[model samples]
Each structure stands twice: as C-alpha cells, then as structure tokens.
Target: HFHVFVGDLSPEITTAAIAAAFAPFGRISDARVVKDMATGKSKGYGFVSFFNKWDAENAIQQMGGQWLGGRQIRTNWAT
Candidate 1:
C-alpha cells in the first residue's frame, strides 16, 4: 500500500492520463487529479495509489522529473 504525489501536471491533464502514465510501472489502484472548485479544472497535481510499494518506488524513479502532457512532473511519497 503506497501512494505517490504527482506535481506540476498539466492543467489539461486527467485521471486517465495519470493512470496511463504510471500503469507501465505496475498495478495502479487509483488515480486522481485534483480539480478546482469553481471551474472544475485540473489543479495541476494528483495522487496515484499502487498495490505494491516497490511499484510506487519504481514509478517515482522513472516518472519523476519526466515529461507528461507537455510538462515535467515531480513525484514524492504521499503524506
């Protein structure tokens, strides 16, 4: 049981995009992109849950500082 914080996401990004981006690493239990209350737009950040901690670590290593949706992303353990 582990989760990753994905930051610097594109404002146009969605939960499906996040899942697709991280799916190669391992099984993703859930993916979510935070949304703005007023406009329901992407908040440029999200969380991804994985069934395995190793998979989460691998995703963080490979996807962190990598490009997605035309923007570089930052990854960290979810608080």
Candidate 2:
C-alpha cells in the first residue's frame, strides 16, 4: 500500500472522514487522522493508505491544495 500524507486538516476531521475524502481516488486500505492521545483531538494531519500506487498518485494530484473543512489540504507521498 502507498501512504499519502495529508496535512492542514481541520480539528474536526476524523478517521472515517479521511477515508471518505480519499475514497474517490481508489481502494483505501486504511486511513487515519492523528490525534492527541490524551484529549483525542485532531493534530491537523493524517495518513491515507491506498491499495494501489497509481491511485495514490492520482489522489495527490487531484486532492492536494483542495479545500476541505474550510482549509486547503496538502497531500504528498508519506516518506
């Protein structure tokens, strides 16, 4: 699977929401929004795991800089 790093997420963003956001690109093997372990608050970043690298690439191109939840998101391959 290819992991895409998503940044600038809203505080309200959740794992399920992240999955929905990337679902259009392809089969998402996994998705998550990092959160404060204690407060369970969003950390403004997440990872979306794609089953196909091609799909991951397409998502990066299409979704990067797109507005979501009143903010422009940044997407890149997770190093």
Candidate 3:
C-alpha cells in the first residue's frame, strides 16, 4: 500500500477532498480524514494511499505545502 500524510488540514476537510487531492496524481485506492470518535469532527489531518507509489511521489512533489481551502497543507510519507 502506498501511503502519504496530509497535515494541517482544515477541520472541514473530508475524505472526498482527500480523494481529490491525490486522484489528480493517480488512482486513489483509499483516502480518509481522521475524526474524533465522540464528536465526529475532523482531526485536522488525514491519510491517502495511491494505487501506485510513483503517483504518491508526484503528489508530494507538486502539492506539498500547497494551499487547500485556506491552509497550506503539508504532505509526506506516512507510517
């Protein structure tokens, strides 16, 4: 599984946005925004995994520290 981290996201960010962010680079096998279990609110970050590792790398190069919805998002490999 090829995975990446999207950090400092807006609270409004969702799995859909996560998909959009990475889909442009390549096929998205999975995407999710971490949310509070009790309140169902976003935790201001998410994980996205692409079908191809190279696509994931391209996303990191083109979109890292790029603005999304008003915040500069940080992109990196996720453990």
Which one is best on TM-score? Answer: 1
Per residue, candidate 1 scores C-alpha lDDT tens digits across 1-79 of: 7999999998878999999999999999899999999999999999999999999999998999999997999999995
Candidate 1 lands at a TM-score of 0.96
Instruction: Give me the runs in candidate 2 sitting further than 4 Å from their true place.
Output: none
- Colliding residue pairs in candidate 2: none
Q: Is candidate 2 or candidate 3 better by lDDT?
A: 2
Order the candidate numbers by lDDT, best to worst.
1, 2, 3
The C-alpha RMSD in Å for every predicted model, in order, reads 0.7, 1.0, 1.0
How much lDDT does each candidate structure score? 0.94, 0.92, 0.88
Clashing pairs in 3: none
lDDT of 2 by residue, 1-79 (tens): 8999999998888889889989999999898899988988999999999999999999999999998786899999995
Q: Which is the winner by TM-score between candidate 2 and candidate 3?
A: 2
lDDT for 67 in candidate 1 is 90
Give the per-residue lDDT of model 3 (tens digit) for 1-79: 7899999998878999978867889988889999999999998899999888999989978889888876889999886
